[PDB]
Design an enzyme around this catalytic site. Structure first.
Site, PDB file in Angstrom:
ATOM      1  NE  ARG A 179      -3.168  -0.037  -1.169  1.00 31.38           N
ATOM      2  CZ  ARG A 179      -3.734   0.782  -2.050  1.00 31.38           C
ATOM      3  NH1 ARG A 179      -4.417   1.842  -1.633  1.00 31.38           N
ATOM      4  NH2 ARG A 179      -3.699   0.494  -3.342  1.00 31.38           N
ATOM      5  CD  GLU A 237      -1.603  -6.462  -5.945  1.00 37.32           C
ATOM      6  OE1 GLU A 237      -0.752  -6.459  -6.860  1.00 37.32           O
ATOM      7  OE2 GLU A 237      -1.626  -5.602  -5.040  1.00 37.32           O
TER       8      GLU A 237
END
Lengths: 285, 475
Positions: A179, A237
């Site tokens: 992130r 993903e």
């Protein structure tokens, strides 16, 4: 002994002696000659007694590349050295510089050392050899004539020695999803250690990415604190790896487990006990 | 002036660090603490803080406390060496680094092994940073003994200032070291350890400084490939594009001389970073007085060559911005299709490479692209006026660069330029001579050594042999 000098003790004592006798203290010259410009050459001329053939070089804009390829006719007809023994002193000076020069911008196969192994006086032929496009893998085809016309090795004894010596030669594996703004630092450190251990990687540089995720035998999901609270690029993903389900490991870093991705175990992060966490994961995936 | 007040030494070094007679563990830690805070306020003050600092550093040297400081770093009881080190940082000026280099490399390199505490590392890292700026001997001593391994260790760290010094140090090593220092830097995989600093989000200086360090190692073609194998190079162009040199800039003539060789390199990444710093230095410098060092250093001619022959906007924009600030004409990018050139195109090209004086000679003889690309040393000497034999060498250096950049679409049929560039990116300049004489891929298997000399014009024989032994390989 101050110029071309590579030891402080020698330089300091010489510099102290020179000042006492009331004379200018020369400045050590840069080793990277090929990158020299006009100003560097001018100062070098003053340090070797050629302050009078200074304007001649400036007018013709002699830089490092030209100086290191300077023939006896260019000296005689363009720069003004009429006397044939003054030109011998100049080449005595240039020989010393070449043996001291720094061919990093120029050399690729470390040919200067190869020449210096044969004779510490052959190292001055590095520039002529490489500016003509030669390396270690090509000297096994050069001829006696070529070393004379092109490279410029004039004396024949040197040429024979060089020849008789030249003739003597005869899929990504892992992925990391993070992130941005929280987890950036961790991912890089994770990469470096795995890179050192023979396992390549495809980390992000910022649908092709989804194809790349499929290629890597392994997967990693960094568990940054307060990361999944947002959920995404992370989602797309992970679901892709769930389809294949190939050795997914989330590394625990301050994550409280606030789908079907938590149905897994992982590795905790110890910032200062590294090479142990890294050693453990190596077995894991 | 106002410094003259402080140059009166209003403190007497606090009676010379308690006179050196503190004698007490709590006392010695105390004594350094105030002389510490004394210097910063002396360092950080308007318009004379920089100049007054040198004298303060000079006073400590002549006072001999540098030996005192170097004497304190050993006390095992003084777990607070921390005051001794951080004081050492600010007082390091060039005249002082020599004194430390003579005798100080003993404890300092011995200090690096105390890798546990943050407070000690975040200053010793600064010590190593300042030493690496010294001559090659100091760096070659630090690298072998363990100083380099100390900095690479601290890449796992997270403290802002510490990571800042570590990266800034590694770059200082590469610039002032040689081929043994650099070859060892890669051998330890230092570029690889530079990615986590290269890929940051909290700070930008840290990313920028790391990109410089890798770029310098990207201007050494003994170890380029190994650097490229790490992947830390792909991050350079985006960053410099993502940022602004206008204000983010906030170096002497010697330091800048080591930035230009970044420009005069074939690596696009190195050219970008160099222009970023180079424009930044120009902007602060132009306001901060005036100086024509850029003419002596030679950055101008290289920057003009980074807009011409340029094939990337980021590189072109930064160079163009730097050139305008220094008050000079901004060259226009030249067309690639040279064979189709006419007189006007050649004239402008001459101005962009320093041959504005041999301009009327070309115009009188009506030199077009076809003629320029077949221009012998006798035509230069007898018709255009280049008497000097080394001026004609510079011209052919220029023409070589153009030919490698030229665009042979109107001329070529079998894509021979790529074939030459596969063998050597410096053979691509022989395309025109080969095709204007009527040759292609299907005919080179009959050309001879003499023909490549008389007709095509390949003068050096080493090139000729390589072309032949490769042409015969087509079969």
């Amino acid at each position: 002994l101050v110029s071309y000098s590579t030891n402080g003790t020698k330089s300091a004592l010489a510099k102290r002696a020179l000042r006492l006798l009331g004379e200018e203290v020369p400045r050590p010259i840069l080793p990277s000659v090929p990158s020299w410009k006009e100003a560097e050459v001018q100062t070098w001329l003053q340090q070797i007694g050629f302050s009078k053939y200074c304007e001649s070089f400036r007018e013709q804009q002699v830089d490092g590349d030209l100086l290191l390829r300077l023939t006896e006719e260019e000296l005689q007809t363009d720069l003004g050295m009429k006397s044939g023994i003054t030109r011998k002193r100049f080449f005595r000076e240039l020989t010393e510089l070449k043996t001291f020069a720094n061919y990093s911008t120029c050399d690729r196969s470390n040919l200067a050392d190869w020449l210096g192994s044969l004779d510490p006086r052959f190292r001055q032929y590095t520039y002529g050899l490489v500016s003509c496009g030669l390396d270690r893998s090509l000297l096994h085809r050069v001829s006696e004539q070529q070393l004379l016309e092109d490279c410029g090795i004039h004396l024949g004894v040197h040429r024979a020695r060089i020849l008789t010596a030249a003739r003597e030669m005869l899929t990504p594996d892992v992925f990391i999803s993070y992130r941005r703004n929280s987890g950036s630092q961790l991912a890089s450190l994770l990469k470096v250690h795995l890179q050192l251990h023979g396992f390549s990687v495809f980390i992000d540089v910022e649908d092709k990415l989804i194809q790349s995720v499929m290629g890597a035998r392994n997967f990693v999901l960094v568990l940054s604190p307060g990361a999944l609270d947002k959920c995404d690029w992370v989602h797309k993903e992970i679901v892709t790896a769930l389809s294949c389900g190939k050795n997914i490991v989330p590394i625990i870093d301050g994550f409280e487990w606030p789908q079907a991705v938590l149905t897994f175990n992982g590795i905790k992060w110890s910032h200062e006990y590294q090479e142990a966490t890294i050693e453990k994961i190596i077995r894991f995936l | 002036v106002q410094d003259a007040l402080e140059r009166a030494l209003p403190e007497l070094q606090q009676a010379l660090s308690a006179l050196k007679q503190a004698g007490g563990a709590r006392a010695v830690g105390a004594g350094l603490a105030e002389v510490f805070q004394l210097v910063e306020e002396a360092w950080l003050l308007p318009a004379v803080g920089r100049e007054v600092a040198q004298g303060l550093c000079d006073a400590i040297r002549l006072d001999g406390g540098l030996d005192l400081l170097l004497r304190l770093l050993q006390a095992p009881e003084l777990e607070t060496r921390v005051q001794a080190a951080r004081l050492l940082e600010q007082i390091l000026v060039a005249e002082n680094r020599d004194r430390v280099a003579r005798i100080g490399l003993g404890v300092i390199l011995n200090l690096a092994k105390e890798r546990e505490p943050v407070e000690l590392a975040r200053s010793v890292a600064g010590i190593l940073e300042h030493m690496f700026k010294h001559s090659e001997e100091t760096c070659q001593r630090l690298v072998a003994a363990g100083g380099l391994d100390a900095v690479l260790y601290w890449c796992r760290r997270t403290d802002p200032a510490l990571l800042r010094h570590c990266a800034l140090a590694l770059g200082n090593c590469a610039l002032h070291g040689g081929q043994a220092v650099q070859r060892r830097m890669v051998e330890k995989r230092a570029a690889e350890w530079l990615f986590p600093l290269a890929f940051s989000k909290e700070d930008e200086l840290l990313r920028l400084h790391a990109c410089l360090a890798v770029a310098v190692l990207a201007t050494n073609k003994e170890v380029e490939r190994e650097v490229e194998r790490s992947g830390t190079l792909a991050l350079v162009e985006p960053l410099v594009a993502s940022l602004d040199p206008g204000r983010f800039a906030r170096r002497g003539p010697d330091d800048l001389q080591r930035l230009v060789p970044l420009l005069d390199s074939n690596r696009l990444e190195a050219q970008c970073i160099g222009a970023f710093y180079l424009c930044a230095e120009a902007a602060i410098k132009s306001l901060q007085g005036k100086t024509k060092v850029f003419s002596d250093i030679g950055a101008i001619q290289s920057l003009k060559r980074l807009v011409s022959y340029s094939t990337n906007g980021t590189k072109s924009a930064l160079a163009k911005r730097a050139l305008r600030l220094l008050g000079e004409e901004v060259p226009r990018p030249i067309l690639p299709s040279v064979p189709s050139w006419k007189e006007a195109e050649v004239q402008t090209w001459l101005q962009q490479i320093g041959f504005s004086k041999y301009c009327e000679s070309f115009r009188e003889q009506q030199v077009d692209g076809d003629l320029l690309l077949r221009l012998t040393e006798e035509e230069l000497q007898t018709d255009l006026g280049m008497k000097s034999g080394i001026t004609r060498k510079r011209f052919f250096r220029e023409l070589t660069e153009l030919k490698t950049f030229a665009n042979y679409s109107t001329c070529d049929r079998s894509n021979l330029a790529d074939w030459l560039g596969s063998l050597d990116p410096r053979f691509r300049q022989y395309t025109y001579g080969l095709v204007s004489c009527g040759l292609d891929r299907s005919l080179l298997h009959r050309v001879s050594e003499q023909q490549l000399l008389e007709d095509c014009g390949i003068h050096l024989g080493v090139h000729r042999a390589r072309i032949l032994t490769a042409a015969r390989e087509m079969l």
